[PDB]
Design a protein that fits this description.
Largest interface: A-B, 79 and 84 residues
Distance between the termini of chain A: 61 Å
GO cellular component, one term (chains A, B): cytoplasm
Oligomer: homodimer
Strand content of chain A: 15-25%
Number of domains of chain A: 2
Strand order of the largest sheet of chain A: 2-1-3-4-5-6
Bound molecules: the ligand O=C1COc2ccc(CN[C@]34CC[C@](C[C@]5(O)Cn6c(=O)ccc7ncc(F)c5c76)(CC3)OC4)nc2N1, manganese (II) ion
EC number (chains A, B): 5.6.2.2
Enzyme class (chains A, B): isomerase
Helix content of chain A: 40-55%
Protein name (chains A, B): DNA gyrase subunit A
GO molecular function (chains A, B): ATP binding; DNA binding; DNA negative supercoiling activity
Chain lengths: 670, 670
RNA sequence: AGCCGUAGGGCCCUACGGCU
RNA sequence: AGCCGUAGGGCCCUACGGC
C-alpha cells in the first residue's frame, strides 16, 4: 500500500504516515513524487506497550512500516539501511489523530529508538477545522504541510531517556491507575520533546474521551452522540405523531450538523436506543430490522426508518423555553444543547455503559415508577438515607427481566457506586413425556447474547464438561417470546444440571456496578443519593428557567397589547399619522411621540394587518390582556416561593410517573 | 451462513433464500425456527449460463446452496438426500430482486432440474413498495409472506422442457441480439410456469435498467441518478454563491427522497460529476479528495463536501417555472423532475456511457462553443446536413485533451450513430543530454488509467516485449500537470519505440461511438443531427412554458395590485368597511360588494400591513404595477410570433456560449 | 478469554455490453 | 480478456477498562 517516491537517495527522501486512503489521495495529489513517499495506515495502530511480540510481528500495519523503513527492529536495528531521513507523522488534525500519533511514537520508541536519536522522526502540522486530510484539496495540503519552502515540521527530540521510559510506561502501559492518576493531576476542565508531546497529545485524547464521548452526563444520562441524535430528530420534527423518517437522512443530518465522526458510530447508537432488549425505556422508534438478542446487527441504514418514542418527548420537553444552555457546534455553523431538559431521571432509568481512558462506567437500568417515587421522597427530605431510598428503589430493573440474587450487592452499589449484582435466568423444570424432563429458560440476563450462550452450553456438552444433557433447542418466536429448552437424560436430577449451568455458563452473569458520570463536566463516582440529588437540582433549574422565560415572554406580549390597545382607541389618528409619513422611520418616530409608544409598540402597529381592524378585535385584545395579567401573577407566585416551585416539579414528575411508569420486570429474590 | 430449522424431517422443512443479512434478520425474527431455515445470499449471484464450470463450482454462494440442499449437482443429484421439501426464493420486491430470481432459477434449471420437476421450488410474495425485507418488521413479514395460514406461494412448474431450454439461452446466454430482440418485441411503454416467470421477471429488470438507470435522456443528457443528485443540490440551495455542503447530507437526502439504491451508487455518480478528467463541463464542485487519473477513489463521504458548479445553474435554470413535468417519486411522498430545463446541450457536451440490458451507450464529450454554433446553424436551417453541422462541430473534445486521428471515424459516428475514433496521447521526442533521448507524454487518452498504462509499459520492458527503453517515470504534479518520461537507449530510434508503444500500450486507444439515448422514453440509436434536433425541440418547449408561466403569474400579480390600488384610492372607505364588519368573512364579503373586488383582491387588502400606507410604500405599489404592465406586454409579444420565440432561444444559447464556451482541447489530425 | 459500546480506518464478490 | 459505470450484497483490524 506504500506510494514510494522516484528517488533512491534516503538523505533527500521523506515518508509521510497518513491514517488511510482518504488522506493518502489528497497527499498523493499534493506531494512531490520525486522526494516524498506516502504510507497510508488503517486507523488506530496497535499499542505495542500493551501487546506481546507475536501480536506485534503478525500486525499488517506494523509489518508494512518496518518494510518501508528498511532499518529492521530492536536489537537488529541498522540506521545505515534507513530508506528515508525523514519519517513524518501526518495524522488528522483531531483528538483521534493525536491518539494515533501517541501510538506511532510508542512503536518508534520501543522498536526504532536510534531513529528518534538521529532526529529522523518529524511531526506534520496540517490546519485544524479539517475532519481529515481527505477534506483538503491537494494544493491546500502542499502549501501548508508539505512544501519544504513553507511547511513547519516538529523534529522529535529525545532528552532524558529515563523520563521517556517512565512516560511511555505511565501513558501507554497496562496499569490503568497510573494513567488515571496522570489525568487527575493534569486535567484542566522547530523541535518537539518526546515526553512533552506524549503528555500533551495523550491528555487531549483522554480528556476528550472522558468529557465528550464515553461517559454520560448526570443530569440527562446521555453521551454526546445520543444527545445529538435526539436533538436531531427534534429539530427536524421527527415526533411520534409524524411518519417514520429515513435512517440515512437522520444520520447524514446529525453527522454534518452536530457529530463529526463515522456514520456507523451514529447509526449504531440510534439502533441501540430503538432496541427493547437494550433500553429499559427506548428513546427511538424503529421501523425495520433493528437487530436481535442473538447478536444480529440492524439492517443497513438504507433499509431502516426511525422517529422519537413518546418518553423522548419528555427528555426534550421545554428545550425552546431557555431551560438549557446552548453552545456552538464543532464548526461554528450551528448551535447544539449542552444538556437536555430531561423530565424523567434517564441516567438511572436507561443506565449507561462506557469505556473511557483511565476509567469506565457501568450503570444499570431501573424502574421509572420506583425512581420517581425516590426523587419525590428526596424532595420531601434532603437528609434521606440510602436505606429509606431503597424502600422506593428496590434495585435495577433490566429490560430483559430475569432475576437478581439478594439486596447485598444492590445495597453496596447504592452506598458506594460500586458493587457486584448477580443476574440469573428465569428457568423452570417441566416434564416432557415418558417420565422425562426439560429445563425451560424464558428470560436471560441483561446484555447476554442468547445464541452465544446456547453455543457455550452446546460446547460444554460436546466437550463432556456437563452431565445429563440430551438436547438443547431455541424455540424463541414472536408468538412465544424467549424460549430456550434443555432436555434432561431420563432419571437425571434436572435441578443439579440447572445449578451446574448457572455456575458454568452465561445463564448466571454478574453486573459490575461502577457509577461514574460527568458532574459539572467532570468524571465522578457517585452513589444512588448523589445521582438523584443532581437530577433533582437539574429539574429545579429547568422549572425555574422555564417560568422565568414565560414571564419575560408574557410581559413582552402584555407591553405589545398596551400599544395595540392605544392604536385601536385612536385608529383614525394612527392611520392619518402613517399616511402622512414618507417612510417607516418617520411613521415609527411620529407614532412614538404622539401616542407615548415604544419602539416595539410602534413596530407592532406598523406590522398590524387590516383584518385586525374588525369589530371583535378590541374585545379580543382586552380578553388576552386580562388573561395575561392573571398568568403573569401565577408565574411571579412560583418565582417568589421556593416551596411552590418545588411542588410544581413534584406535580410534573407525578404526571410522568402516571403516564409512563410501568411494572417491575426483574424479580429480586431474597 | 445458513440459519437452520429445529426439525430434520425434510417433508415439513422449508428453506428461504434472501438477498443478504439486512433481509435475513427480519426473516430470522419472523420465522417458525422449527420448520423454516434461512440462507442469506450476497446480492447478485453468478450467471451459470455465461460462466465456465470451474468458476461455478468454486463460487462461495453456489457452494452454500448445494451444501444446504444436500442433493449434489447435475448428474450426482439425488432428490432423496434433499434437506428441505420447499426451496422458497424470497428476494426484494424491486427490479434487482426479479433479476436475482432469474439468476437463481437459471442455476436451479441447469444444475438441479429434478428439484423443479418435484415441485420443490417456490416463489415467496412479499408486499410491494419495500426497498428490502429489512425495511419490514418481523411480524409484518411473518403474516404477509411466511405464515402458512395467510401466505400466497407460487410453485414453479416446468411445462415444455424444449421451450425452457430455449428461454434460458435467450435471456441468460451470451448472445445479446436474441435478448435485444426479445426486449424490443415485448417492451410496453398456486402454480407458476418457469418460462412465464423468467420472461416477466427478466423483462421487468431489462426495461428498468434501459429507461430508469443506464441510459441518458436525449433532452438533458442525464441518467436518473445524475438528475436526482443535481435536483437535490437545487432543492437544498447548494448553489455556487453558497458554501460547500457535506457529501453525506447530499447523499442521505437524494437516497431518502428520490433514489432508492445504495449510497455507493449515489456518491460515486456525484464524485465523477466533480472530476475534471471525467467531465468536459464538471457538474459538481467538490471540496477535498475527489479521486485521480491513477484510479484512486474519492475520500469516504464523511470527508468530502460539494455544491453546484456555475454551469449546473444553466441545467436547472427556471425549473420552478412550469418548464418541465414533475412526477411522483418512488414512494408517493415527494415530487421529482422527469427532465431538467438543460439550457446548454449536456448530452453531447459531457457525453455518456452505460451498460444496460440488450444494449449499451457510448457518447463522447464535445466542445460547448462548437455545439451551440451547431444548434444555432440548425435553428436557421431545419434541412442542414451532418457535413454542414460538422463545419461547427469538428468532433469530440475530451477533458484529458490528446489527439484524434482523422475525420473518418467521426463522420461515420455523426451519420449513423456508430463509429471507431482513434485517440492518441500527446507525445514528443526530446533530448536529455549526452546524445541520448526521451519520450515525453503530457496528455493521455480519455478514460485511460495513467498508473495502469505505466505498469503496462513497465511489464513490456521487463518481459522483453519492447526494445530500447532505459527508464520509465511519472513526473506529474499539480504544478507541472501530466508528465510521463520514457528514456531511450543511446542511438535507438525513439520514433520507432514510440510507434511500438502506440501499437502495444493504451497510449493509443479507440473510442467506439454508440449513440443510444432515451427518445420519448424509448432507447434509440441517433446520429448528430437527431441529437441536436431533440435538444432544440426541448429548448423551444422550455422557453415557451417559462413565458406562459411568467404571463399567468404577472397577470395574477397585476390583479392583486389593481385591488391594493383601488384600496389606496379609497382608504377611508376601506377602513370604514373593515371597522363596521364583525368578522373577517363579513369584511371580505362587504369589500367585494362595495368595491367590485374579487375574493383574491379582498384578501390581499385584508392582509395588507399598516406600514404599506406610507409615502414610499404607496409608490412601490404603483411602480411595481407599471413595471408589470410593460412585462405582460413583452411576454404577450413572445407568444404572438414564433420567430420571436425562436430568436429568444437563440439569444439565450448565445449568452451561455459567451459565458461558458472554452477552447478545444483535443486536436483533430489529418 | 473476550465481551460490552463509541471511536480510528478500509475491500471484494456478483450483472450487464462492446470494445480490445 | 478485462475494463468501463450504475446497480445487488456484506467484514474485519485497531484503542480503551473491568471482570
Ligand atoms: O451520512 C450518511 C447518509 O447516507 C448514508 C447512507 C448509507 C450509508 C452506509 N454506507 C457505508 C456502509 C459500509 C461502508 C464501509 C464498507 O464499504 C462496508 N463493508 C462491508 O460490508 C464488508 C467489508 C468492507 N471492507 C471495507 C470497507 F471499506 C467496507 C466494507 C461503505 C458504505 O461505510 C459506509 N452511509 C450513509 N451516510
Ligand atoms: Mn482521522
Ligand atoms: Mn435488495
Amino acid at each position: 500500500k506504500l506510494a514510494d517516491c522516484s528517488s533512491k537517495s534516503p538523505e533527500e527522501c521523506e515518508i509521510f504516515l497518513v491514517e488511510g486512503d482518504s488522506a493518502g489521495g489528497s497527499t498523493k495529489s499534493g506531494r512531490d513524487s520525486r522526494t516524498q513517499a506516502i504510507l497510508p495506515l488503517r486507523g488506530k495502530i496497535l499499542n505495542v506497550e500493551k501487546a506481546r511480540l507475536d501480536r506485534i510481528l503478525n500486525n499488517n500495519e506494523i509489518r508494512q512500516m518496518i518494510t518501508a523503513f528498511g532499518t529492521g527492529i530492536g536489537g537488529d536495528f541498522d540506521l545505515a539501511k534507513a530508506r528515508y531521513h525523514k519519517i513524518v507523522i501526518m495524522t488528522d488534525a483531531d483528538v483521534d489523530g493525536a491518539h494515533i500519533r501517541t501510538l506511532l511514537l510508542t512503536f518508534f520508541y520501543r522498536f526504532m529508538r536510534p531513529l528518534i536519536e538521529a532526529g529522523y522522526v518529524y511531526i506534520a502540522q496540517p490546519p485544524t477545522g479539517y475532519k481529515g486530510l481527505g477534506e483538503m484539496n491537494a494544493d491546500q495540503l502542499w502549501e501548508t504541510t508539505m512544501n519544504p519552502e513553507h511547511r513547519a515540521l516538529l523534529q522529535v527530540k529525545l532528552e532524558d531517556a529515563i523520563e521517556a521510559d517512565q512516560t511511555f510506561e505511565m501513558l501507554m502501559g497496562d496499569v490503568v491507575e497510573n494513567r488515571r492518576q496522570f489525568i487527575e493531576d493534569n486535567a484542566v476542565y522547530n523541535e518537539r520533546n518526546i515526553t512533552s508531546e506524549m503528555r500533551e497529545s495523550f491528555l487531549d485524547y483522554a480528556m476528550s474521551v472522558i468529557v465528550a464521548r464515553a461517559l454520560p452526563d448526570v443530569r440527562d444520562g446521555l453521551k454526546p452522540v445520543h444527545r445529538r441524535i435526539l436533538y436531531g430528530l427534534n429539530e427536524q420534527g421527527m415526533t411520534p405523531d409524524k411518519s417514520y423518517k429515513k435512517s440515512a437522512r437522520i444520520v447524514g443530518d446529525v453527522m454534518g450538523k452536530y457529530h463529526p465522526h463515522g456514520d456507523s458510530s451514529i447509526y449504531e447508537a440510534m439502533v441501540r436506543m430503538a432496541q427493547d432488549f437494550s433500553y429499559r425505556y427506548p428513546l427511538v422508534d424503529g421501523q425495520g430490522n433493528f437487530g436481535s438478542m442473538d447478536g444480529d446487527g440492524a439492517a443497513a441504514m438504507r433499509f431502516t426508518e426511525a422517529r422519537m418514542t413518546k418518553i423522548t418527548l419528555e427528555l426534550l420537553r421545554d428545550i425552546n423555553k431557555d431551560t438549557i444552555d446552548f453552545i456552538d457546534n464543532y464548526d461554528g455553523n450551528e448551535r447544539e444543547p449542552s444538556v437536555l431538559p430531561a423530565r424523567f431521571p434517564n441516567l438511572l432509568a436507561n443506565g449507561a455503559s462506557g469505556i473511557a481512558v483511565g476509567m469506565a462506567t457501568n450503570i444499570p437500568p431501573h424502574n421509572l415508577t420506583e425512581l420517581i417515587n425516590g426523587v419525590l421522597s428526596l424532595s420531601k427530605n434532603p437528609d434521606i438515607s440510602i436505606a429509606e431510598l431503597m424502600e422506593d428503589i428496590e434495585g435495577p430493573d433490566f429490560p430483559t427481566a430475569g432475576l437478581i440474587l439478594g439486596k447485598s450487592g444492590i445495597r453496596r452499589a447504592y452506598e458506594t457506586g460500586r458493587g457486584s449484582i448477580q443476574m440469573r435466568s428465569r428457568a423452570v423444570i417441566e416434564e416432557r413425556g415418558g417420565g422425562r424432563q426439560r429445563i425451560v429458560v424464558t428470560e436471560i440476563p441483561f446484555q447476554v447474547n442468547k445464541a452465544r450462550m446456547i453455543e457455550k452450553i452446546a460446547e460444554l456438552v460436546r466437550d463432556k464438561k456437563i452431565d445429563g444433557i440430551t438436547d438443547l433447542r431455541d424455540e424463541t418466536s414472536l408468538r412465544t417470546g424467549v424460549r430456550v429448552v434443555i432436555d434432561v437424560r431420563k432419571d437425571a436430577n434436572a435441578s443439579v444440571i440447572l445449578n451446574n449451568l448457572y455456575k458454568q455458563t452465561p445463564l448466571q452473569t454478574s453486573f459490575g456496578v461502577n457509577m461514574i458520570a460527568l458532574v459539572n463536566g467532570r468524571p465522578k463516582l457517585i452513589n444512588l443519593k448523589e445521582a438523584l440529588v443532581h437530577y433533582l437540582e437539574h429539574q429545579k433549574t429547568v422549572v425555574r428557567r422555564r417560568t422565568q422565560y414565560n414571564l419575560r415572554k408574557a410581559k413582552d406580549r402584555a407591553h405589545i397589547l398596551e400599544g395595540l390597545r392605544i392604536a385601536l382607541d385612536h385608529i383614525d389618528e394612527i392611520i392619518s399619522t402613517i399616511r402622512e409619513s414618507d417612510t417607516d422611520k418617520v411613521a415609527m418616530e411620529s407614532l412614538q411621540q404622539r401616542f407615548k409608544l415604544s419602539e416595539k409598540q410602534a413596530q407592532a402597529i406598523l406590522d398590524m394587518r387590516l383584518r385586525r381592524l374588525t369589530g371583535l378585535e378590541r374585545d379580543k385584545i382586552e380578553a388576552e390582556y386580562n388573561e395575561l395579567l392573571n398568568y403573569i401573577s401565577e408565574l411571579e407566585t412560583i418565582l417568589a416561593d421556593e416551596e411552590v416551585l418545588l411542588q410544581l416539579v413534584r406535580d410534573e414528575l407525578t404526571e410522568i410517573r402516571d403516564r409512563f411508569g410501568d411494572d417491575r420486570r426483574t424479580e429480586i429474590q431474597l
